[PDB]
Amino acid sequence: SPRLVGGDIPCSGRVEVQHGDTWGTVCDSDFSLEAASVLCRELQCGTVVSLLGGAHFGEGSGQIWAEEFQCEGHESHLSLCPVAPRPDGTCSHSRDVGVVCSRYTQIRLVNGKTPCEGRVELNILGSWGSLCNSHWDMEDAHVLCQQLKCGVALSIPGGAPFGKGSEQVWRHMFHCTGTEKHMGDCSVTALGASLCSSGQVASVICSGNQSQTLSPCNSSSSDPSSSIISEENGVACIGSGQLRLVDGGGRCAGRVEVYHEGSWGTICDDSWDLNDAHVVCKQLSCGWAINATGSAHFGEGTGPIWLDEINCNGKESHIWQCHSHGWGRHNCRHKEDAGVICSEFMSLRLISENSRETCAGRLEVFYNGAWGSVGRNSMSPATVGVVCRQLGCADRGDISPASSDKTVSRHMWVDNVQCPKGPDTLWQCPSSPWKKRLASPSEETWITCANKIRLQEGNTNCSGRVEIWYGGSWGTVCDDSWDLEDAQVVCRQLGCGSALEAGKEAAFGQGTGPIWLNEVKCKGNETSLWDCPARSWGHSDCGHKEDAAVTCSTR
Ligand SMILES: *[C@@H]1O[C@H](CO[C@@H]2O[C@@H](C)[C@@H](O)[C@@H](O)[C@@H]2O)[C@@H](O[C@@H]2O[C@H](CO)[C@@H](O[C@]3(O)O[C@H](CO[C@H]4O[C@H](CO)[C@@H](O)[C@H](O)[C@@H]4O)[C@@H](O)[C@H](O[C@H]4O[C@H](CO)[C@@H](O)[C@H](O)[C@@H]4O)[C@@H]3O)[C@H](O)[C@H]2NC(C)=O)[C@H](O)[C@H]1NC(C)=O
Ligand SMILES: *[C@@H]1O[C@H](CO)[C@@H](O[C@@H]2O[C@H](CO)[C@@H](O)[C@H](O)[C@H]2NC(C)=O)[C@H](O)[C@H]1NC(C)=O
Ligand SMILES: *[C@@H]1O[C@H](CO)[C@@H](O[C@@H]2O[C@H](CO)[C@@H](O)[C@H](O)[C@H]2NC(C)=O)[C@H](O)[C@H]1NC(C)=O
Ligand SMILES: *[C@@H]1O[C@H](CO)[C@@H](O)[C@H](O)[C@H]1NC(C)=O
Ligand SMILES: *[C@@H]1O[C@H](CO)[C@@H](O)[C@H](O)[C@H]1NC(C)=O
């Protein structure tokens, strides 16, 4: 029923809702993340990446609905959601709301008899291109054939039987587990990804829909299977990967957890060494191990301790092939849970030399066990916004002028980062391949991100209406329980001096967008308003007439 209009990528655009024959738009104060998540699910577009206010995909025409959608979040249709007519707002079409959903992938098969076979093409940065044969597996093929409604995947032939194509190769590495129902639901990396030999391109043959798509396997009674395909209730089924890493801050690090007898469980760190970790990292397509961690380094598990005294020599393609003590009944506690850090683990930081700054510094990436600088070549404002969103700031920032210093000191990891529309992390952005080399500050990137809190419409930047950035868009704070202790937190976070006032009742003017917080009840010693007790993320009965303000002293 709902439609997205005016987007550049699929599953994006301005939100439009029909009643009767009349389409209308929704004001950016009326449409929550929960309502956005119901729309993305209903439209088969995955999950919500961004809620965007301010007529980002252009202003609409005609009707604007006066209704708020009070979705719980798990409704199947937007029509099932409770609707509250709010008082008749000052919303024009310059505040029509918009949504980026997660299934923005543009992928197809070209030059076979049907769309059920051919060379894989991916559209990135307005341009169709191939994928590398070495970057594409059978798990990826099963997901794509289900997406194209073409049954199951038969083959991934390497010798280009449908033509190499007259075009570019994207170096993207999909890491589908095999149980996903759209390529947009799979984890994917493009950052630093290696080139492949010319014309070594990926191809898929699907079965067609004369076979139905396999369901995921649901059983953990037996020893886990090392094949993609298992047998369950007289039907073939895709093995859901019964190994995960948790609490590592990424796909290729964290505590090793294993699914058996209906429960996720941990591994004891006795005899847990690098060879064991290598097998884990191989099985997850995470490269090689750089660390086998013990001593509950990423935290302690909730569930049984299934495996102990695992002694892989490193041959094995799965941890289930390794010699252990078998399932359950071991003489150790969760203070010794095992984990890994693998060579494909990626992390991101800004480093200030003398500190004081929170959203500013030299951009650095962690890869293959090492930190290194990100080069500044080709780097657009939109790429800096993705960086700044990923580091926990607002989605905008500025690159400092290049240093005159042409003499090499630090290691660089990657350069030529060029983010497309849609990802909110740097890892799905194409670049040059990883190359550890020495580099001068001439080549390095210093970033000043916009903070996720600001004061608008006063005589300094330390005085005005409180606005907070969350989930895509700037929004406001309601003034119920908003006191001087809240203002002392806002002033401290901005790096202003003493709080003078906690203003109420839209004293510097009403804002736009959603109202992200109400019932903010700070102790008063917090370093950020995100540490404060509040009714978080858009559940409020307020309007923009009740917007909160802070006035602080400079310096
Ligand atoms: C297996 O795949 C094929 C191919 O499907 C298409 O390609 C894949 C890659 C996907 O993208 C998929 O979404 C595509 O559709 C499926 O064949 C298609 O099947 C659909 C559904 O049955 C057909 O639509 C119609 O059935 O067409 C009927 C009219 O058929 C005449 O006209 C067609 C051209 O328009 C001719 O191809 C056909 O030979 C006839 O001469 C029409 O009666 C149907 O409409 C009625 O029912 C719908 C609800 O389903 C209702 O909304 C309407 O009001 C109406 O009452 C319907 O339009 C496709 O024409 C057909 N495409 C091709 C290329 O053959 C196949 O269904 C699928 N099998 C399974 C098990 O899923
Ligand atoms: C993961 O492995 C690396 C490599 O051994 C560890 O880095 C070293 O840490 C020790 C002690 O902290 C230092 O003496 C070495 O100089 C470091 N070497 C290198 C090459 O970086 C790292 O500490 C390990 N991390 C975890 C969590 O186990
Ligand atoms: C602000 O003050 C509160 C006091 O209520 C500090 O809260 C403590 O948090 C830890 C969490 O590990 C508790 O174990 C302590 O018992 C709490 N109270 C005290 C008195 O320490 C809070 O950490 C303070 N924050 C800042 C940034 O100063
Ligand atoms: C496993 O469970 C899922 C979700 O309940 C279901 O859709 C699927 O058909 C099941 N598959 C098998 C082989 O039992
Ligand atoms: C406000 O403006 C001054 C002018 O240079 C700037 O230095 C300062 O960092 C700004 N403060 C905030 C909280 O934006």
Side-chain angles (χ1 to χ4, degrees), residues 492 523-528 531:
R492 185 175 294 108
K523 284 87 189 181
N525 67 321
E526 295 86 347
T527 52
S528 170
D531 303 341

Side-chain angles (χ1 to χ4, degrees), residues 326-340 342-350 352-405 407 409-446 448-467 469-517:
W327 296 102
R329 317 180 201 168
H330 307 290
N331 298 322
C332 61
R333 296 295 182 197
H334 284 87
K335 68 192 178 299
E336 276 170 323
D337 284 340
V340 305
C342 307
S343 74
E344 287 295 317
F345 176 73
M346 293 167 200
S347 179
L348 204 71
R349 77 192 177 177
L350 288 176
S352 292
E353 286 287 323
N354 296 113
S355 187
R356 182 61 182 166
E357 289 167 348
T358 56
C359 281
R362 182 183 72 252
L363 180 61
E364 285 196 350
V365 61
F366 186 84
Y367 179 74
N368 278 353
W371 290 102
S373 293
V374 179
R376 63 188 291 124
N377 284 315
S378 311
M379 188 178 293
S380 65
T383 308
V384 175
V386 172
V387 167
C388 288
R389 180 168 181 174
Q390 188 178 347
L391 292 170
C393 311
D395 58 353
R396 193 204 65 78
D398 299 318
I399 307 180
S400 310
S403 178
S404 303
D405 189 10
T407 59
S409 175
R410 286 182 287 276
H411 288 279
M412 176 184 293
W413 260 122
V414 72
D415 201 4
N416 306 107
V417 191
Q418 189 77 263
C419 285
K421 300 191 181 78
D424 62 355
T425 70
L426 205 62
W427 322 134
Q428 307 193 0
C429 300
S431 64
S432 299
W434 298 109
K435 186 176 66 173
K436 193 175 184 58
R437 64 175 175 86
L438 286 171
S440 63
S442 170
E443 314 171 8
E444 293 177 342
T445 312
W446 270 262
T448 301
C449 304
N451 197 359
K452 60 180 186 302
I453 189 166
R454 62 190 181 177
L455 294 177
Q456 289 295 105
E457 294 177 359
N459 296 334
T460 60
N461 55 14
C462 285
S463 176
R465 179 183 62 246
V466 180
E467 285 175 3
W469 192 90
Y470 184 81
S473 55
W474 287 97
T476 59
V477 184
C478 176
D479 65 7
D480 63 342
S481 76
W482 185 257
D483 54 12
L484 183 63
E485 283 83 1
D486 300 335
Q488 288 164 354
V489 173
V490 170
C491 296
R492 185 175 294 108
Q493 177 172 2
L494 286 174
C496 302
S498 290
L500 300 176
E501 196 208 27
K504 299 183 187 182
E505 296 300 317
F508 292 67
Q510 305 183 10
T512 60
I515 303 159
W516 285 129
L517 293 177

